[PDB]
């Protein structure tokens, strides 16, 4: 019994600050309190049951602030300590009770820096930079181990993957993906790391790949219904689904769910807002 939050920031042209919640109980996509400031290309990941939204473009300012959201009370608070530098199109994940925010874009030369966050102290301190700059990267965590999947450096989209050990504070490159993917989506379905969608060197795309943590090799996966660049992906009370994105025509608001026993994707109704590059969070209630 989980729910998926969606914190998007791309539509028509203007960034958006509306936040959406899906509960499978009623199977409805009803809204919640919008974010106190628009965030374009957000990073979000829940940290002990509080949705965290790490800054991004608001339509003009790239921005460095952070906002958390208490889902039980429906309240957004801009009280979390800011970041070192203003950056957008950055993935974030949670691990060992600390909030890691990987590299992104800041209107100059991508970024490879990675900074943590102590929720108990609000310090927000920086750990080991990443090597190979990554904007529009998606992240995931398998085996207490923080993975940075794909993205774009200063010039081209990447197929390389770098994993991080918090205790030794250093990065270790691992198996490159099949295809180059910037603005992809990742979660940790079925004790493997699935990555779907994105945009390669040319066009948006629908292929998908799974990484086996125990063989250290990526395995191609069945493709989605439509191309979906700048998407999110999260596993909700059992089922893997990707959300929103772009496909070379219009902003998407639909979601697809992976059925492993049938090895295909099934389009569902989807959310209200058409979301490009919009983070997702998952909470159990």
Q: Where are the domains of the chain?
A: 2-284
Other beta carbons within 10 Å of 203: 10
On the 0-12 / 13-18 / 19+ scale of CB atoms within 10 A, 50 is middle
Q: Tokens standing for 95?
A: 């691990």
Task: Give the separation between CA 9 and CA 19, rounded to whole angstroms.
Answer: 9
Task: Give the separation between CA 154 and CA 134, rounded to whole angstroms.
Answer: 8
Task: Give the separation between CA 225 and CA 19, rounded to whole angstroms.
Answer: 25
In the β-sheet with 31-32, what is the strand arrangement from edge to edge? 31-32, 19-22, 2-7, 279-284
Q: Tokens standing for 108?
A: 């100059």
246-247-253 Cα angle (round to 5): 50
Classified as helix, coil or strand, 60 is coil
Contact 46, 281 (CB under 8 A): yes
Q: Tokens standing for 128?
A: 């080991």
User: What is the sign of the dihedral through the CA atoms of 95, 4, 37 and 86?
Assistant: positive
Classified as helix, coil or strand, 115 is strand
Provide the Cα torsion 235, 284, 67, 161; round to 10°: -30
- Among 2.120.10.80, 2.40.30.10, 3.50.30.30, 3.30.465.10, what is the CATH number of 2-284? 2.120.10.80
Classified as helix, coil or strand, 189 is helix
155-160-166 Cα angle (round to 5): 115
Strands 92-95 and 185-187: unpaired
φ/ψ bin of 202: left (φ > 0), alpha (ψ from -120 to 50), beta (otherwise): alpha
36-37-40 Cα angle (round to 5): 140
Q: Tokens standing for 74?
A: 């429906």
Max CA pair span of the chain: 47
This structure was determined by X-ray
């Amino acid at each position: 019994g989980e729910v998926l939050f969606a914190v998007g920031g791309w539509a028509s042209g203007d960034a958006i600050s509306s936040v959406e919640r899906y509960d499978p109980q009623t199977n409805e996509w009803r809204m919640v309190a919008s974010m106190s400031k628009r965030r374009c290309g957000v990073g979000v990941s829940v940290l002990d049951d509080l949705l965290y939204a790490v800054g991004g473009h608001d339509g003009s300012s790239y921005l460095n602030s952070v906002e958390r959201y208490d889902p039980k009370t429906n309240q957004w608070s801009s009280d979390v300590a800011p970041t070192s530098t203003a950056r957008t199109s950055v993935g974030v994940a949670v691990l060992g009770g600390f909030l890691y925010a990987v590299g992104g874009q800041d209107g100059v030369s991508a970024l490879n820096i990675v900074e943590r966050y102590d929720p108990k102290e609000n310090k927000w301190t920086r750990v080991a930079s990443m090597s190979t700059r990554r904007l529009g990267v998606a992240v995931a965590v398998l085996g207490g181990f923080l993975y940075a999947v794909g993205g774009s450096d200063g010039t081209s989209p990447l197929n390389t993957v770098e994993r991080y050990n918090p205790q030794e504070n250093r990065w270790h490159t691992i198996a490159p993906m099949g295809t180059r993917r910037k603005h992809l989506g990742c979660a940790v379905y079925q004790d493997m790391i699935y990555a779907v969608g994105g945009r390669d060197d040319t066009t948006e795309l629908s292929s998908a790949e799974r990484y086996n943590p125990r063989t250290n090799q990526w395995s191609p996966v069945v493709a989605m219904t439509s191309r979906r660049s700048g998407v999110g992906l999260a596993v909700v009370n059992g089922q893997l689904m990707a959300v929103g994105g772009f496909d070379g025509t219009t902003y998407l608001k639909t979601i697809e769910v992976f059925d492993p026993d049938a090895n295909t994707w099934r389009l569902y109704g989807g959310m209200n807002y058409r979301r490009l590059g919009g983070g997702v969070g998952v909470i159990k209630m």
